[PDB]
Design a protein around this ligand. Structure first.
Ligand SMILES: CC(C)CCC[C@@H](C)[C@H]1CC[C@H]2[C@@H]3CC=C4C[C@@H](OC(=O)CCC(=O)O)CC[C@]4(C)[C@H]3CC[C@]12C
Ligand SMILES: CC(C)CCC[C@@H](C)[C@H]1CC[C@H]2[C@@H]3CC=C4C[C@@H](OC(=O)CCC(=O)O)CC[C@]4(C)[C@H]3CC[C@]12C
Ligand SMILES: CC(C)CCC[C@@H](C)[C@H]1CC[C@H]2[C@@H]3CC=C4C[C@@H](OC(=O)CCC(=O)O)CC[C@]4(C)[C@H]3CC[C@]12C
Ligand SMILES: CC(C)CCC[C@@H](C)[C@H]1CC[C@H]2[C@@H]3CC=C4C[C@@H](OC(=O)CCC(=O)O)CC[C@]4(C)[C@H]3CC[C@]12C
Ligand SMILES: CC(C)CCC[C@@H](C)[C@H]1CC[C@H]2[C@@H]3CC=C4C[C@@H](OC(=O)CCC(=O)O)CC[C@]4(C)[C@H]3CC[C@]12C
Ligand SMILES: CC(C)CCC[C@@H](C)[C@H]1CC[C@H]2[C@@H]3CC=C4C[C@@H](OC(=O)CCC(=O)O)CC[C@]4(C)[C@H]3CC[C@]12C
Ligand SMILES: CC(C)CCC[C@@H](C)[C@H]1CC[C@H]2[C@@H]3CC=C4C[C@@H](OC(=O)CCC(=O)O)CC[C@]4(C)[C@H]3CC[C@]12C
Ligand SMILES: CC(C)CCC[C@@H](C)[C@H]1CC[C@H]2[C@@H]3CC=C4C[C@@H](OC(=O)CCC(=O)O)CC[C@]4(C)[C@H]3CC[C@]12C
Ligand SMILES: Cc1c(CC(=O)O)c(=O)oc2c(C)c(OCc3cccc(C(F)(F)F)c3)ccc12
Ligand SMILES: Cc1c(CC(=O)O)c(=O)oc2c(C)c(OCc3cccc(C(F)(F)F)c3)ccc12
Lengths: 707, 707
C-alpha cells in the first residue's frame, strides 16, 4: 500500500523548511591554479602517461607471454608484408613504398601507444583516400617547366604521398596535444554502417584495374566511382584471361578457407595461414612456368634493397591538400580507436583516447619523412594478431622485424608475384562490410530516423566520395536531432482513480478533470525550433487566445469610460445602473500608432465597482467569456531552455496573467530553476511562487485557494 | 494537506485495472485517400487560398480605409522610387533597372500575397548578394571571342542579374509548391542578430565607393570586405570633397529628423518625409549651381523612358550560380516572413507561410524576365507604409503607380541627383542594425551557448561572406544543441522527510537512503553522443563494474568445479565441507578464443547447495563482494532514445541482471514504453515488469519484496 500524509509544498516553502548544504562555486581561476601547479608526484604521472612503455615493460610476465608473442608476431608480420605490397597499388606508387608504411608506425607505436592488441600499418580505405588526395594535388600544381617520362610522373606521386602523410600526422598530433580526443562520439552507428557499406563498394570497384589488367586514368572527382566504372567497361574486350582466372581461383580458395577458421575457432590451434600459402603457390607457379612471357601478366617488379634517404615536405602540396588531410586524419583516428576499444573491453585494460592521437601522429610524421604513406590499424590484421595469441606489442615489434628482413634481404623473392593475386587478397576481407546491406530492413522497422541516416550516408559517400561524403553525413545526422523534436506530441492530462496519478486525457475511460483547471504537457526540451509550435498547441488546447480577449476587454473598458464621463451611465459601489436603453452603437476605430494601447494591463482601480468580465456588461457590449482560471504546465520532460524559449514563454505567461488566469509550472529540479534566474525571467508580474513540486500539489493548492 | 491512500502500481498492473480506450492507427494509405479526394467545398478552399484577392477585395471597408490607403501609397511610392534608384548602384548596373525592381513584384503581390502591411521591392543586403553573384558569374563565363567597351561590360551584368533573379524566383516558387515553408524555424534569434550586425558592416563598407567617389574593382571572394577596404584606402588621396561634404550633411539631417519621428510618434499626424525633402533640395541645388562642371561629381545620368523588351534567361549563367541563388532565395523569404509576422501579430490576421513563397517567387520571375533584379520587403519601407496609415495592399498599388509615372514621364528630373546623396540615404537605416552590438554582453551573462552562436555568426559572415557564412552559421548552431547535452549532470537521489519526495543526495542535510538501493537520474535525452558518458557515470555512481565482478564470479566457479570433480572438496545440500587446508593456488590462465566464456550467465543448478557470492568461499578464493541489490533509474527527463542508446542500455541492464541486481525504470509515459517495444528491447531476461510509475512505487515494492 502507498500511504502518504504530507503538507502541500511549493518549491519556495520547501526550501524554507529544509536546510540546504551550500556548495562553493568553482569559477575560471581556481581551475587554473588547480591545473598548473606542479608536484613531485604530478610530473611523474604525466611522464608515465606520455611513455607507457616505461609502465608495461617492467611488468612483463615472461613465462606466460613470450612464446605466444613470438608466434603472433611472425604470423602477423607475413600478413603485414603482403598487405603493404597490396595497398601501395591503391596509391599508384611503386610497391616498395608500402613496405615502409608497415615498418615505421609499428616502431613508433611500440613506444608511444596504449593499446596491446593493435597492429599498425596501412588499410585499404585510407590508401584510396591518400591516392585521391595525391592525384588531386598533382593536377593543381604549377606547370613550371621524350623517352623516359613515365618514371618521372611516379616520382612526383611519391613526394605528394609523403607530404600528405606528414600533414595528416601533424593534424593528428596537434589534436592529441589539445586534448580533444572525444570527437569520436559525433559518429552514430548508422552513419558508420552506411559509410562502411559504401566504402566497401569503392574498394571493390577500385580493384578492377588489376584483375582485368586494364589502364585507367587518375579520376579525382565528386563522382569518381562511376568514371572508374566507365573507364573499365569501355575497354573490357582487352582483358587478360590469365589475370582473371588466377584472381578467381585465389579469391575462391581464401574465401572458403577464411570461414573454416571461424566455423572451427575451437578444435584448431594457430589458424591456417592461407594468404601466405596461396602467395607462395602463386609466386612459385608464376616462376618456372614463365607467366610473364607465355601470357602477358603484370608482376611486382624488381624492388631495390634498402631504405630511402629522408625527404623534405613540399609546402605547395601543403597549400592545396588541407581539406583532404583533415578527413584522412579523422578517419584514421576513428577507425583505430573503434578497433582498439573492442579488445580493451574484451581484456579489461584502460585505453587513453588522447595518447592514441599522439602515437598515430608521430608514427605518420616519421613514416612520411622516410617516404611511406599514411595509415593506422587494419581490422583483419589486428584480428590475425589477436587470434594467434598476441598478448602485447612485442608482436608488433617482431612483425616490424620481419618487414625489415624483407626490405633489406629477401626482396628478390616476390618478383614473380602476379599483381592480381595481391588484388584478390584484398577482396577477401569485404564479406563483413558487404553483409551490412541487411540493416536497411532492420532499421526500417525500429527507428526510421536512423534508416534515413543510413541511406543518406550511403548516397553521400557513393556520389560525393569518401572525404566530402563523411562531412555531409555528419551534418545530416545533426539535422535528424532537430527533426526528432520539431513537432512533439503535446497532450492534456486528467486524473485517474481520484488519486495523485495524471495521464493522457484521450487514453482512459473515466478520467476526472477539475472545473476550470487545464493541465498541459510538452514531452521535449523547448528551444528555437520548437517554441512557436508549443505556443500554437497550447492556445489550441486551452480553447482561446489570451491576447485577443485582452484586446476585447480593453475595447469594452474604453467604451465604458467614454459612456461614463459623458455622464450617461451611473456608477455605484454595486450594480452599474444605466440611464438609456440603446446608444448609437458605434464601433470606434483607432488608427495605427495608437492600436498598441489595447495590449496594456487593465487597471480599473479608479472605478469603485469591481468588473467581472464573465457576466453580461450593462449595455450591449459583447466581450467573450472564458471558464478557465488556472493552468498547470507539466515541465518534467523539458530538459533545457534557451533565449528564444525564455522570451516566448515569458510572453505566453504575461498574456495569461493579465487575463486573470493563474499559471503554475510543475515538475522541475533545482538546476532548472537556478538556470531560470540567470535569464532575468522573474519580475513583479511573473513571480517565483508559480513553481510547485508535483501536479497534485498544484491541484490541491488550487482547490483550497478557490474556496 | 496531501493525503493519498493507494495501491502500488507497476505500469502493467495499472493497465490491468484501468480499461484503455483503443485508438485506430493511421498508416500511409488512409492519409492518401483523405488528401486526394475532391469535394465541391474543397476546391473552393484551395482556389481561394491561391488567390486571396478574391477574398479581401469584396470585403473592403471603403469609408474607413480608402483615404488612408491613398496617403500611405503616395508617401511610400516616393521612398520606393528613391530606394530603387539607390540600390541599383549596389549591383553596379544603370540606375533605371532599380525602378523595374520596384514595380513588377508589387503588382504580382497584389494578386497572390497574404500580407496587408508589406511593401515589396528591393533591400540592400539582397542587392549586395545579387551583385556578388553577378560578378562571380561573369568571371566564370567562357571567353568566347577599342573605344566603346565599358558599355558592353554593363550589358552582360544586366543579363546576369536578370538570370540570377529568375533562378531565385524559380527556387522560391518550387519551395512554395512543395509546402516546406516552415524552414524559417531553423534560425534562432542569436544567429539572426549576429548575421544582421555583420551585414550592416558589409553595407557600410560597400557605400564608400560613392561617398568618396573612388573606383573599386569587383571583388568576389571569401574575404571581399577587406579587399574592398584595401582598394578604397590605397587611393584616398584622390577623393572628391564636394561628394563628401554633401553626404555628411544629408546623413546628419536625416539622422536627426528620423529620430524626432520616433520621439514624437504622438502629437504629429503623417510623419515628416525627409528623404523626399532632402532629395528635392540636393537635386535642386546641384542644378543651377552646376555641380557637374564646377566640381566633378558623379550624377545619376540620363535615363531613357519606357520599359525594356523581355529577355531570355541564359542557362550558362544558371549553371554556375546555383549555390548563390539558393542563399538569395532563402534570405529573401526569411526576411519577408519575419517582417510580415510583426504586423500579422499586431493587427490579428492569419499569415500563410507557403503562399508567401509562391507570391515572392512569381514576382521575382516576372521581375527578372523584364530585366529587374531580385527582392522582397524592406523593413524601413514597410515601416513607412504602416506608420502612415496603410490598411491593405491598395497602398502598394498606388506606390507602383507612382513608380510607373516616374518611369514613363518624369524621369528627366533626378538627372542632377548627386549619387552620394543616394548613398547617404541608405546609411540612415543602419542605426537599428548597428545597435545590436550590445548583445554580446547581454547574452554573456544569460546563456553562453547563444553568445557563442552570436560570435561565430559574426565571424563567419565577416570572413566568408553573406552567402556561405549563413550556411556555416546554421551548421554551428546545430552543433551547439549537441554541445548542450554531451555531459549532462547526472546525480544520485535520496529521500527527504520520510515521504514521497526524492532529491539530490548532495544538496540537503538529513536525507535517508535505503539499504542496498541506489537511485540514479540522468536529466537529458540519451542518444549516440551521450551513452558512453551515461555508462561511465552510472558505474562510477554505483561503486563497481558489473562485468568485472561477473568475470571474477565465473573464474571462482571454474576453480570450484575443477576442485570438485577431482573429488577433493565435498558437496552437501548445506555447508561446503572441505578436505585439505591449502592447495597449490594456481592462477589458471585461459587463452584467447576461450576468454569469452567468462561473460556467460552463471547456472549453478547442477550443484545442490545455493552459492552466496557474499560470504567467504570455502578455500582461499577471493571474489569481491557488493552490497547492492536494487537499482532505480529515473527516466523522467529522458525525452527520446535511438538505436545506439537502446543497444547500450540493453548491455548495461543485461550486465546488472546477471549479477543478481534487480533493475527498475521509473517515470516514463506510455509513448516511451510503446516506442521501446519496436526496438525489440524485451526478451526472456529483460522483461517488461521493470517499469513502474514513480520512485516511491519502486521503493515500496522493494521494501516488501525483500521481507
Ligand atoms: C538530393 C540529394 C538526395 C542528393 C544530391 C546529390 C548531388 C549533390 C549530386 C547528384 C548528381 C551529381 C552530379 C552528377 C554528374 C556530374 C558531372 C560531373 O562532370 C563530369 O562527369 C564531366 C566532366 C569530367 O569528366 O570531369 C561533375 C559533377 C556532377 C555535376 C555531379 C555533382 C553532384 C551532383 C549534383
Ligand atoms: C543510381 C544513382 C547511384 C546515381 C544516379 C545518377 C547516375 C545515373 C549518373 C550520375 C553520375 C553519372 C556519370 C558521371 C560521369 C560519367 C563519365 C562520362 O565519361 C565520359 O567519357 C564523358 C564523355 C563521353 O560521353 O564520351 C561517361 C558518363 C558517366 C559515367 C556518367 C553516367 C551516369 C551517372 C552515373
Ligand atoms: C588548429 C590548430 C590548433 C591545430 C591544427 C594545426 C593546423 C590547422 C596547421 C598546422 C600546420 C599548418 C600549415 C603549415 C604551413 C603552411 C604553409 C603556409 O603557406 C605558405 O607558406 C604559402 C606560400 C606563401 O606564404 O605565399 C600556410 C598554410 C600551411 C599549409 C599551414 C595550414 C594550417 C596548418 C595545417
Ligand atoms: C579546433 C580545430 C577544429 C580548429 C580547426 C581550425 C581550422 C578550420 C583552420 C585553422 C588554420 C586554418 C588554415 C590557415 C591558413 C591557410 C592557408 C590558406 O592558403 C593561403 O593563404 C594561400 C595564399 C597565400 O599564401 O597567401 C588556405 C586556408 C588555410 C589552410 C586555413 C584553413 C582553415 C584552418 C585549417
Ligand atoms: C577558426 C575559425 C574561428 C575561423 C576560420 C576562418 C577561416 C575559414 C578563414 C580565416 C583566414 C581566411 C583566409 C585569409 C586570407 C585569404 C587569402 C585570399 O587571397 C587573397 O587575398 C589573394 C588573392 C586574391 O586577391 O584573390 C584567399 C582566401 C584566404 C586564404 C582566406 C580563406 C579563409 C580563411 C582561412
Ligand atoms: C581581425 C579579423 C576580423 C581578421 C583577421 C585577419 C586579417 C588581419 C587578414 C585576413 C584577410 C586579410 C586580407 C586578405 C586580402 C587582402 C588584399 C590584398 O590586396 C593586394 O593588393 C594584394 C597584393 C599586394 O599586397 O600588393 C591586401 C591585403 C589584404 C587586405 C589582407 C589584409 C589582412 C587581412 C584583413
Ligand atoms: C529540388 C526541386 C524539387 C526544387 C528546386 C528545383 C531546382 C533545384 C532546379 C529547377 C530548375 C533547375 C535548373 C534548370 C536548368 C538547368 C540547366 C541544365 O544544364 C544544362 O543544360 C547545361 C548544358 C548541358 O546540358 O551540357 C541543368 C542545370 C540547371 C541549372 C538546373 C539546376 C536545378 C534547378 C535549379
Ligand atoms: C528539398 C530540397 C532541399 C532539395 C534540394 C536539392 C538540391 C540540393 C539538388 C537538386 C537538383 C540539383 C542540381 C541538378 C543538376 C545540376 C547541374 C550540375 O551541372 C552540370 O551538370 C554541368 C555539366 C553538364 O552540363 O553536364 C551542377 C549541379 C546541379 C546544379 C545540381 C545541384 C544540386 C541540386 C540543386
Ligand atoms: C578498410 C576496412 C576493412 C578491410 C581490412 O580489414 O583491412 C574491414 O574489414 O572493416 C573495416 C571497417 C569495419 C571499417 O569501419 C571502422 C570505423 C569505425 C568508426 C568510424 C568509422 C568512420 F566512419 F569514421 F569511417 C569507421 C572501416 C574500415 C574497414
Ligand atoms: C537590409 C535591412 C535593413 C535596411 C533597410 O531597412 O532596408 C534594416 O533596417 O533591417 C534589416 C534586418 C533587421 C534584417 O534582418 C531580418 C532577418 C530576419 C530573419 C532572418 C534573417 C536572416 F538571418 F535570414 F538573414 C534576417 C535584415 C535586413 C535589414
Amino acid at each position: 500500500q502507498y500511504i502518504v500524509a504530507r503538507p502541500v509544498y511549493s518549491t519556495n516553502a520547501f526550501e524554507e523548511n529544509h536546510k540546504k548544504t551550500g556548495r562553493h562555486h568553482k569559477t575560471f581561476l581556481d581551475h587554473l591554479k588547480v591545473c598548473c601547479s606542479c608536484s613531485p608526484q604530478k610530473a611523474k604521472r604525466i611522464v608515465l602517461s606520455l611513455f607507457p612503455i616505461a609502465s608495461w615493460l617492467p611488468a612483463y610476465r615472461l613465462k606466460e607471454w613470450l612464446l605466444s608473442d613470438i608466434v603472433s608476431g611472425i604470423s602477423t608480420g607475413i600478413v603485414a608484408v603482403l598487405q603493404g605490397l597490396a595497398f601501395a597499388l591503391l596509391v599508384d606508387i611503386p610497391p616498395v613504398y608500402g613496405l615502409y608504411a608497415s615498418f615505421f608506425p609499428a616502431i613508433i607505436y611500440l613506444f608511444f601507444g596504449t593499446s596491446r592488441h593493435i597492429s599498425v600499418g596501412p588499410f585499404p580505405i585510407l590508401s584510396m583516400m591518400v591516392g585521391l588526395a595525391v592525384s588531386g594535388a598533382v593536377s593543381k600544381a604549377v606547370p613550371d617547366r621524350n623517352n623516359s617520362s613515365l618514371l618521372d610522373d611516379e616520382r612526383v606521386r611519391v613526394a605528394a604521398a609523403a607530404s600528405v602523410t606528414v600533414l595528416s600526422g601533424i593534424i593528428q598530433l596537434a589534436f592529441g596535444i589539445l586534448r580533444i580526443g572525444f570527437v569520436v562520439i559525433y559518429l552514430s552507428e548508422s552513419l558508420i554502417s552506411g559509410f562502411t557499406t559504401a566504402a566497401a563498394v569503392h574498394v571493390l570497384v577500385s580493384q578492377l584495374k588489376f584483375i582485368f589488367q586494364l589502364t585507367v586514368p587518375s579520376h579525382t572527382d565528386p563522382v569518381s566511382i562511376f568514371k572508374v566504372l566507365y573507364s573499365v567497361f569501355s575497354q573490357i574486350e582487352k582483358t587478360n584471361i590469365a589475370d582473371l582466372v588466377t584472381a578467381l581461383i585465389v579469391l575462391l580458395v581464401v574465401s572458403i578457407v577464411k570461414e573454416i577458421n571461424q566455423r572451427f575457432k575451437d578444435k584448431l590451434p594457430v589458424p591456417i595461414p592461407i594468404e601466405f600459402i596461396m602467395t607462395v603457390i602463386a609466386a612459385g607457379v608464376s616462376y618456372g612456368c614463365d607467366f610473364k612471357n607465355r601470357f602477358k601478366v603484370a608482376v611486382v617488379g624488381d624492388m631495390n634493397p634498402g631504405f630511402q634517404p629522408p625527404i623534405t615536405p613540399d609546402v605547395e602540396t601543403f597549400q592545396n591538400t588541407v581539406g583532404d588531410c583533415f578527413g584522412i586524419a579523422m578517419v584514421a583516428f576513428a577507425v583505430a580507436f573503434s578497433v582498439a576499444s573492442v579488445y580493451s573491453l574484451k581484456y579489461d585494460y584502460p585505453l587513453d583516447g588522447n595518447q592514441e592521437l599522439i602515437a598515430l601522429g608521430l608514427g605518420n610524421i616519421v613514416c612520411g619523412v622516410f617516404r611511406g604513406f599514411a595509415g593506422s590499424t587494419a581490422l583483419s590484421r589486428s584480428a590475425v594478431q589477436e587470434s594467434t595469441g598476441g598478448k602485447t606489442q612485442i608482436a608488433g615489434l617482431i612483425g616490424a622485424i620481419i618487414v625489415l628482413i624483407v626490405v633489406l634481404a629477401i626482396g628478390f623473392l616476390l618478383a614473380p608475384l602476379q599483381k592480381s593475386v595481391l588484388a584478390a587478397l584484398a577482396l577477401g576481407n569485404l564479406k563483413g562490410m558487404l553483409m551490412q546491406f541487411a540493416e536497411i530492413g532492420r532499421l526500417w522497422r525500429k527507428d526510421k530516423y536512423d534508416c534515413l541516416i543510413w541511406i543518406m550516408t550511403f548516397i553521400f559517400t557513393i556520389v560525393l566520395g569518401l572525404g566530402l561524403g563523411l562531412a555531409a553525413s555528419v551534418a545530416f545526422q545533426l539535422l535528424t536531432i532537430v527533426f526528432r523534436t520539431q513537432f512533439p506530441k503535446c497532450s492534456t492530462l486528467a486524473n485517474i482513480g481520484r488519486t495523485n496519478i495524471y495521464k493522457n486525457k484521450k487514453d482512459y475511460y473515466d478520467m476526472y478533470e477539475p472545473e476550470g483547471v487545464k493541465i498541459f504537457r510538452c514531452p521535449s526540451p523547448i528551444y528555437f525550433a520548437n517554441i512557436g509550435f508549443f505556443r500554437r498547441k497550447l492556445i489550441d488546447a486551452v480553447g482561446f487566445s489570451p491576447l485577443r480577449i485582452l484586446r476585447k476587454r480593453n475595447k469594452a473598458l474604453r467604451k465604458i469610460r467614454k459612456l461614463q464621463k459623458q455622464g450617461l451611465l451611473q456608477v455605484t459601489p454595486k450594480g452599474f445602473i444605466c440611464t438609456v436603453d440603446t446608444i448609437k452603437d458605434s464601433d470606434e476605430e483607432l488608427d495605427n500608432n495608437q492600436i498598441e494601447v489595447l495590449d496594456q494591463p487593465i487597471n480599473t482601480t479608479d472605478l469603485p465597482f469591481h468588473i467581472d468580465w464573465n457576466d453580461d456588461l450593462p449595455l450591449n457590449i459583447e466581450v467573450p467569456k472564458i471558464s478557465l482560471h488556472s493552468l498547470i504546465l507539466d515541465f518534467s520532460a523539458v530538459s533545457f531552455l534557451d533565449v528564444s524559449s525564455v522570451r516566448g514563454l515569458k510572453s505566453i505567461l504575461q498574456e495569461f496573467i493579465r487575463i486573470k488566469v493563474d499559471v503554475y509550472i510543475v515538475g522541475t529540479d533545482d538546476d532548472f530553476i537556478e538556470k531560470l534566474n540567470r535569464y532575468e525571467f522573474f519580475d513583479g508580474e511573473v513571480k517565483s511562487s508559480i513553481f510547485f513540486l508535483t501536479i497534485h500539489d498544484a491541484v490541491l493548492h488550487i482547490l483550497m485557494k478557490k474556496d
